[PDB]
Amino acid sequence: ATLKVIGVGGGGNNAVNRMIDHGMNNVEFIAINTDGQALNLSKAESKIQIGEKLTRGLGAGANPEIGKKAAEESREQIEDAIQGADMVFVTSGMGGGTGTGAAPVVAKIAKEMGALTVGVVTRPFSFEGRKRQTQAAAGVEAMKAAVDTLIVIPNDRLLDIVDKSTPMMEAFKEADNVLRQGVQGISDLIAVSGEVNLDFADVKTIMSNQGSALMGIGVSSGENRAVEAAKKAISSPLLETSIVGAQGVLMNITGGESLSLFEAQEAADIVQDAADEDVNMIFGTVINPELQDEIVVTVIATGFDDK
Ligand SMILES: Nc1nc2c(ncn2[C@@H]2O[C@H](COP(=O)(O)OP(=O)(O)O)[C@@H](O)[C@H]2O)c(=O)[nH]1
Ligand SMILES: NC(=O)c1c(F)ccc(OCc2nc3cc(Cl)cnc3s2)c1F
């Protein structure tokens, strides 16, 4: 299955560039921007400049109407870059002119090209002011209507995970981790035949036309490793959507030859208990003999009923 990561606007493009810098294979990066200057600096193999006649190579200067018009006019260029994709991840910062307006258009195009469409967007910091928050909210709602599943990261949550000295770029890398882990994790699920196999169809079942989603990973070792990894996987300090309310979960447990049945049940019970509703679980398991004493629990949670 073909996986594509699309950065729309300033923040989306930045997330794409920091992910390339980190290292990712089997994934195509597409950079979409009105801003020609930022595009020339993109590390993405695929670059699409939208609304060149509309903005003259500049940004959309906080007007979502410009980003929407710019993406529509370049529908053909967007389709060609997407072509072949089975799954499309659209990343954008909401609140600006480009991301807010263009990202939902890009998402609708991917969805109409038969791609499983996942949005990973940020809401602006409260310090950016009320009008920026209002425009982002309209962009978030438009994103929800265009994608299969939407993961929202309020930028204010980054202030909950930093200390007074944490560099801003390091804080931004922590938000990139949500998308990065989700992308790498899905790619791995598709590439590896697990002892209890999960494949692209299982990803579609959990993600198609769902609305809100939670994505998480937890790594743990030693005593109580399964419970610890599962609690970490469902913890959402950066996410708007919490595990509470999830009615559907795709959950995978990766472990060495020591992976016990008892601990797989302990881990699945943490997920079932945390949700508050009975969850329809799509359970997976992988035996990686290289992991030794480490256990990795991955979760994709949906069924919040809000598309
Ligand atoms: N977490 C994060 N947020 C960003 C980043 N860059 C921009 N933002 C946020 O995204 C919103 C829109 O900015 P931007 O993507 O540059 O605007 P655009 O190019 O017009 O769509 C800003 O209001 C900030 O909240 C980034 O690198 N990381
Ligand atoms: N049981 C399997 O067929 C299998 C596999 F053989 C390799 C990896 C797997 O899952 C990896 C994942 N990693 C992540 C991270 C996030 Cl943040 C969300 N979801 C996932 S799913 C699997 F489910």
Taking domain 210-307, whether its CATH number is 3.40.50.2300 is answered by no
- Best CA proximity match to 266, nearest among 222, 208, 227: 227
Domain ranges, ordered by start, for the chain: 1-209, 210-307
Q: Do domains 1-209 and 210-307 have the same CATH topology?
A: no
Q: Is the dihedral of CA 241, 243, 244, 249 positive or negative?
A: positive
Beta strand pairing call for 211-212 and 149-154: parallel
The alpha carbon of 87 and the centre of ligand 2 are apart by a number of angstroms equal to: 15
Determine which helix (DSSP H) or strand (DSSP E) holds 12, and give its type and residue range: helix 9-22
How far are the Cα atoms of 188, 217, 288 from residue 212, in angstroms, in the given order? 23, 17, 31
Other C-beta atoms lying within 10 Å of the C-beta of residue 193: 8
> How far from chain centre, in Å, is Cα 139?
16
Please report which residue ranges of 41-167 form alpha helices under DSSP H.
52-55, 64-73, 75-82, 98-112, 130-146
Binding residues for GTP: 10-14, 97-99, 128, 132, 176
Q: How does DSSP assign 157-201, residue by residue?
A: GGGGS--TT--HHHHHHHHHHHHHHHHHHHHHHHHS--TB---HH
3-state secondary structure of 155: helix
Residue 244 DSSP label: T
Ligand 1 site residues (CB inside 6 A) read 9-11, 14, 59-60, 93, 95-99, 122, 124-125, 128, 132, 155, 172, 175
Order the strands of the 248-255 sheet from edge to edge: 214-221, 294-302, 248-255, 280-287
Sequence-distant (6+) residues with CB within 8 A of 3 are 26, 27, 28, 85, 86, 87, 89, 183, 186, 187, 190
Sequence-distant (6+) residues with CB within 8 A of 133 are 95, 123, 124, 126
For residue 262, give both structure tokens. Answer: 């008892």
- Best CA proximity match to 35, nearest among 12, 14, 51: 51
CATH number of 1-209: 3.40.50.1440
Sequence-distant (6+) residues with CB within 8 A of 221 are 293, 294, 295
Sequence-distant (6+) residues with CB within 8 A of 188 are none
- Best CA proximity match to 188, nearest among 302, 291, 82, 81: 291
How far are the Cα atoms of 56, 179, 219, 239 from residue 158, in angstroms, in the given order? 34, 15, 21, 10
| Residue nearest to ligand 1 atom 27, measured at CA | 11
- CA pair distance 127, 92, nearest whole angstrom: 19
Contact by Cβ (8 Å): 139, 104: yes
Query: φ, ψ for residue 181 (rounded to 5)?
Result: -60, -40
The alpha carbon of 105 and the centre of ligand 1 are apart by a number of angstroms equal to: 18
- Best CA proximity match to 52, nearest among 64, 34, 39: 34
Task: State the closest ligand 1 atom to the C-alpha of 35, by its place in the atom list counted from 1.
Answer: 19
Contact by Cβ (8 Å): 31, 48: yes
